[PDB]
Amino acid sequence: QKPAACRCSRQDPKNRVNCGFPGITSDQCFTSGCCFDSQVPGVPWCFKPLPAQESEECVMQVSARKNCGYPGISPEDCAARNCCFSDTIPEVPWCFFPMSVEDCHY
């Protein structure tokens, strides 16, 4: 299934992880759960989407996270402060500010 827009557009083209086989079409790429973009040269055209989050406002590259909490903040407290919580990647804030989706596109 085609991934939500932010899982595709919020990635730096140079950080793209290739998805599918050589020559996979735009439709096949989307159908496979990947993102397709034929506009940037020299980078994968069919690529893996960013991990899905609780909401699409919480989708962004790990390096774009703005710390909305503190060391040891709980998921619930983070949710109270109106933020996104994700503790699966090292060195990055686990509680972070979400970003409205107007920038997202295919």
Swiss-Prot record:
The gene is TFF2. One of its GO terms (molecular function) is growth factor activity. It is found in: Secreted. One of its GO terms (cellular component) is extracellular space. Inhibits gastrointestinal motility and gastric acid secretion. Could function as a structural component of gastric mucus, possibly by stabilizing glycoproteins in the mucus gel through interactions with carbohydrate side chains. Residues 6-50, 56-99 form the P-type domain. Found in pancreas. The keyword Disulfide bond applies. GO terms for biological process: chemokine-mediated signaling pathway; maintenance of gastrointestinal epithelium; negative regulation of gastric acid secretion. Keywords: Disulfide bond, Growth factor, Pyrrolidone carboxylic acid, Repeat, Secreted, Signal. Disulfide bonds join 6-104, 8-35, 19-34, 29-46, 58-84, 68-83, 78-95. The keyword Disulfide bond applies. This is Trefoil factor 2. It comes from Sus scrofa. The lineage of its organism: Eukaryota, Metazoa, Chordata, Craniata, Vertebrata. It comes from the Eukaryota.
